[PDB]
Design a protein that fits this description.
Chains A, B, C: It is an enzyme of class 5 (isomerase). Chains A, B, C: Keywords: Arabinose catabolism, Carbohydrate metabolism, Isomerase, Manganese, Metal-binding. Chains A, B, C: Pfam families: AraA_central, AraA_N, Arabinose_Iso_C. Chains A, B, C: It comes from Limosilactobacillus fermentum (Lactobacillus fermentum). The structure is cut from a larger assembly and holds 3 copies of chain A. Chain A is an alpha/beta fold. Chain A has 14 helices and 20 strands. In chain A, the strands form 6 sheets. In chain A, strands 2-1-3-4-5 form a 5-stranded parallel sheet, sandwiched between helices. Chain A has a 4-stranded parallel sheet with strand order 7-6-9-10. In chain A, strands 18-17-15-19 form a 4-stranded antiparallel sheet. At the A-C interface, helix 7 and helix 8 of A face helix 8 and helix 9 of C.
Chain lengths: 474, 474, 474
């Protein structure tokens, strides 16, 4: 399944222990009514739990110790009901090695202008008890994500809906394994960058596997497990011209079905979720892994083109917090300078994700010497035209710096005529000239994850959390 | 005539050696157009030239370096056709010693939907190849601009033209010499910055040949050049009641340009395009130079006023980029407060650059208890109405900085024969208070330099390449 | 002979024309003959060439402009015989891209007290002018080199002989290509820096050509070619109990003998001067190249072991510096904690440069379980005792850095039969618990370069001319 269900968020309620056994249960009810009531309507990703209720120091120091050994813990969700002693959230928060969410709220909504007495003060005091906590989360520069409001607004549980996602994907990224079937392309600069810091920093882990190592696994695969994949091939997509049976490129599509069930076969049996693909080293391979990737691309997997371990372990990354809608990954091939149809043509060689499409033509006719390899078959289409935001991560001499645009990606002014592969065109939101200025000025490469789903700032949170700079640009 | 006639600008077509002998040279005939097709009606003043095809590295360490040497080169406009693998650029961009420009552009500007195969996406793919080339820069923290658009635009033909200028003056301001016969005015601060700093940082060598050393030359003018240079003056200027043909004040107005002439000798002798004077130091010659400065000013000469070698240069730098504009030098001389019609107006003792003129009535009424020397002749003219810019300079202890006003000047109110000097009353773009308040507590003073020629965009380049900070004031 | 012989270093003298043209020549007689002297008996590694005598702005500025452009020039060793004002060295010092000395020297080595007029003082005055050079190159923060003492002092002549050999690499690194035959061996960190990030700094270039492409070379060798190179090594190494033309199987030697012929071929024909091999990548090659790697070292190349492009392009870097010298490479094998006889023996899996040796018994009984290929051929030998620094390179989140325990190499405790490896056995110049622990502090792994030939003050200025921090333990 989508791994965001095994992942649990624990919810802790905070108070000042010296309130007797009378108020310290007259609170957990409202709190057990927050959690198990949050689950049942939220439309959240992960159902929230309710462990210990914070009051004594060491008690909160011990929920955080436990929030860290329980791998199930997506993150941690913290709300104070009463004026919580924040010097009781030190030794806990010093050592918290996982997400934090300050929810500033009250068990209710309005202010009971009728019964509001000193019994609704020492009990249900949350504006001025949260600020004491958010000091100790700011002063300790703990990463943290604060959400304020009654848990009963449109954008007060939605915002939370699109955050279970990230927190998860932060624990999860430290579980990327990018397996490399050939080093970075030569002479190339941007698609490169430290690997020792990407694993310190982004937890991720780039393992290299020789291209011959893989040729074995690819070939050594049943000629009819391939036909077993062919039953979906002919069925799940409209094969055409040299693609079906008995026609031109006959064996060619039964080359790309061989390339996928060996990649996937390889990756899993050893641990890997992402992988790479140099066309300057396919020594033992029939044709450029393309349709093979466009399936793998559609199975939660991550992948980056020429050695590009970054657009591979990051494709994974967004695609792992995209267990709610649809995403992608894109290069920036050509663009049109039109007085009003300003636009860029984003697509890669053979591998353009079927995560945004319309139809699904399965085509051939190539002469792809771009590798020195057999005419490959791919999934030519024409993707989506809705919300969007490109990403790309760049190693700039002092660790990485995610440089991110906001944009509206639109349809093209054609189908896919003289066009052997797919496309998801766009006009950059700030403007082409203005989306290249503050882009070509700062970092910015070509192998770029375009996303329609995730939010202009729901990413700024995970970025702010893995712990690296983010050049956004509206 | 102007110095953008002996500079040249080179050009390199970014491509790579994996397309074929007639898919590489395809850009030896594609960017030979952009080159060829932007010199005639290409909207420039400076003359572009093409050299090698950039593929390998040893070719870039040859391109960038062959410039370095050949002093005759002036700049470098780079644009990568295909996807040049940047890493192969690296020594080049670091051995670089001239002002560089990612000219991010394409060949066509359309998107031939009906005809755009892979051999049409293998060329004109600049949407990713002036980004790989970009990154190398944004990371090699290179001092560099960014033009974005087709080269067939007359708007970004400006963007290019407005840059050809900054690249000319930078290369220039490093030969700009200075002779001082006159130190700093007794205890005045903004007209004093670091010497060995500004020379390192702005190229200006400033030497101080003695005030008597001038005196010598001024009295070495042929008395026949004290008549034959006279009539070439009074065939372009109309005088006033005092400096007449045989008025009593004739002789001192005649030894008032025995100064302009022996300065030019000196100036062109020690080769000192920029010069300074000082009134607290005239102890050897007669009257005080004014017109004679103006008869160097509208010519082509840097003058720093009450000794002020910096504003000398910023009067000489910002001209040096105007091969076809206006541009002056202005010690503000009084503000005019009026709760809805506020303004500033500035002149000097005698020197107002007659390059903003529209008349020039050689007025006299030549009082001068300033410097203790005789009644000196001068001009008294008008200025250019409409727009322009203002900008100063000030050693602020960590090094220099640049403040750079944006505002408007026009023509005076009532008649001004009560001021035997020139005038030019200006205002401010964001309210005279604010425009003065942010200039105030952030350093810099009177001796600005008003240039009706360039702009905020144009002036975020010289500093940026001179690598001095720039406090932008509009 | 040497490429180092093809190189020269220039030599300037400075002053100002205001010093009597006769006396201006009076240095051009003194200077010239020290040049001459430094050459005529110097045993300096490389030439000298008295270029322009230093006075005006331009006159120095131009000079420094050819020394950039004239790739034949490897550095300029300055000396200001008399007070040469700085501001005439500024913009000539700030456009240099190539190693600089400021020689601190007197002509004679004894003040004349019978014959000292003011002419002995207006001339021969480096005591107070060399000092004024220094400030303009200290201010400006030039990576420069100072030598103080009489130009004829073997040790002040020794300081230059070691420098000449040390500017020869900040002017050769920017040329060291490294060929990779597989990315870095999985799960290691120290042998990973940034390929882009070091092309800027140390100047090296790491393109990766796929194991395959070498394997073609490798296989396409003639046994003529092999058997010719396969009999000249019978001339040098007493091939032991496992080598006769029908004894056991000496196909395993020749393979390593066409191996040295194979890689040597690849490298040479594509321009690479150094290279790594991943044993976790040996599809196609026979056994894991060893003797062949041990040959090539002796040939002159950079090998960097388990993928290490950082001891690849470092070996060759420092190797090159020690031409007419020694020098090798090193991993630490084991220790021998014996309270007194404490020390560190090092070798490597096979790859030991026979340039530190005193024996040469060619060997086998290889059963290298590693790589799981046939039984590799390898040279065996005991190294040389003596002095030598131990540098190593390693990137560290904010860029590289050099760490370098000095040591004292030795001769083996006994003989190692079963140990089929060539082996050095050393100990730091501070202790196996006093210097392995400071080296453990500062980072920097096991792969190193032991250089019985380069000396801590030679490195201290090599790394000064790249600005990478060096650490100093011993």
């Amino acid at each position: 399944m989508r791994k965001m269900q095994d992942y649990k968020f624990w919810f802790v309620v905070g108070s000042q222990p010296l309130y007797g056994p009378e108020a310290l249960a007259e609170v957990e009810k409202d709190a057990r009514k927050l959690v198990d009531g949050l689950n049942k309507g939220g439309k959240l990703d992960y159902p929230v739990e309710f462990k210990l209720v914070a009051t004594t120091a060491d008690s909160i120091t011990k929920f955080m110790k436990e929030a860290n050994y329980n791998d199930d813990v997506a993150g941690v969700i913290t709300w104070m009901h009463t004026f919580s002693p924040a010097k009781n959230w030190i030794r806990g928060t010093e050592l918290l090695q996982k997400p934090l969410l300050h929810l500033a709220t009250q068990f209710l909504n309005n202010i009971p202008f009728d019964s509001i007495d000193m019994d609704y003060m020492n009990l249900h005091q949350s504006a001025h008890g949260d600020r004491e906590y958010a000091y100790i989360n700011s002063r300790l520069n703990v990463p943290a994500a604060s959400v304020y409001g009654w848990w009963g607004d449109a954008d007060v549980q939605e915002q939370i809906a699109d955050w279970q996602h990230v927190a998860v994907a932060y624990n999860e990224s430290f579980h990327i394994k990018i397996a490399r079937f050939g080093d970075t392309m030569r002479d190339v600069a941007v698609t490169e960058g430290d690997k020792v810091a990407a694993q310190i920093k982004l937890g991720w882990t780039v393992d290299y596997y020789p291209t011959n190592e893989l040729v074995a696994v690819v070939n050594g695969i049943a000629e009819d497990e391939i036909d077993a994949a062919y039953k979906d091939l002919e069925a799940n997509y409209d094969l055409v011209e040299g693609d079906n049976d008995h026609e031109k490129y006959v064996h060619n599509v039964r080359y790309q079905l061989r390339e996928y069930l060996g990649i996937k076969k390889f990756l899993d049996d050893n641990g890997y979720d992402a992988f790479t693909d140099n066309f300057q080293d396919l020594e033992g391979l029939e044709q450029l892994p393309g349709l093979a990737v466009q399936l793998l691309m559609i199975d939660g997997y991550g992948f980056g083109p020429e050695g590009d371990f970054k657009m591979a372990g990051l494709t994974r990354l967004l695609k792992i917090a995209a267990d709610n809608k649809q995403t992608a990954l894109m290069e920036d091939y050509t663009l049109d300078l039109r007085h009003g149809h300003e636009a860029i043509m984003g697509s890669h060689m053979l591998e353009v994700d079927p995560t945004l499409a319309s139809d699904k033509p399965r085509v051939e006719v190539h002469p792809l010497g771009i590798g020195g390899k057999d005419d490959p078959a791919r999934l030519v289409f024409t993707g989506a035209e809705g919300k969007g935001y490109d990403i790309t991560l760049s190693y700039f001499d002092d660790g990485y710096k995610f440089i991110g645009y906001p944009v509206d990606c639109k349809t093209p002014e054609a189908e896919m005529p003289k066009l052997p592969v797919a496309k998801q065109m766009w006009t950059p939101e700030i403007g082409l000239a203005e989306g290249a200025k503050q882009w070509m000025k700062y970092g910015g490469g070509h192998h770029t994850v375009l996303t329609l789903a995730l939010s202009e700032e729901q990413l700024e949170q995970l970025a702010r959390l893995f712990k690296v700079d983010f050049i956004n640009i509206k």
